[PDB]
């Protein structure tokens with residue numbers, strides 16, 4: 001048929017003892033193309049690209065919109081897929097009403113209410129939440145977001161403690177990008193800070209590495225991911241994965257990094273088909289514009305056998 005025979009990378013990675021091979025998606029994708037069909041066949045977990053971000057879910061203080069998030073949760077449950085959520089605390093997609101707050105107590109209450117409301121709504125149904133995203137500067141210091149500037153460094157401890165109470169079953173992650181190389185200061189810095197936060201009792205269950213790679217950089221993940229795992233969190237994960245050129249070598253190296261790290265639970269790719277990627281011109285995903293698996297997909301299948 002037009003659809004091509006294939007194997008599920010999610011089925012294969014589970015048979016290797018990992019939890020999932022996942023994909024970022026949302027309602028716009030699930031209703032179009034072959035996205036739903038490919039996700040049903042080949043992936044075991046879904047993450048909302050945008051529908052759980054702060055601008056989508058709490059556009060006005062205390063006025064929540066769960067329509068896109070509900071769609072994804074409902075779709076995942078109906079299709080037997082795990083669900084991840086996030087990002088609960090992130091500077092990038094933040095409504096103006098939040099970034100304009102200057103009172104530390106107010107912003108703390110706002111952040112806690114945002115975390116608690118989103119996590120409570122889906123309590124027991126979500127595998128993992130990305131509680132704090134992109135909290136680090138490239139030099140390893142903390143990024144000067146409204147949360148850091150107004151609340152101070154304690155915002156990370158408070159966010160995680162609040163998330164734990166909202167849904168004790170969820171795995172709570174901190175996530176950042178440019179953690180793909182051991183040579184990079186951000187990688188060692190997040191490890192050191194996470195070690196110190198865990199010594200302070202912060203319930204950081206996971207470090208998620210947002211893995212946007214250019215050609216050849218897969219090999220670096222083989223040293224970076226073990227370094228991330230040395231922070232001692234229960235879990236690490238590869239997330240938002242895409243690879244310029246989608247070389248089988250790079251993708252297989254990332255997969256093998258996860259297989260080589262006992263605490264790595266799985267891998268999430270940043271979409272299904274190349275034309276829908278934020279980097280589409282670099283054809284960086286595992287399915288082409290015809291929704292057929294690319295050589296990198298086949299190479300992952302062969303590596304996971």
Ligand SMILES: O=[N+]([O-])c1ccc2nn[nH]c2c1
Nearest residue numbers: 024047086087130239240268
């Ligand atoms: O693993 N992901 O691709 C992914 C996509 C969007 C997200 N928002 N929060 N966490 C996310 C993870």
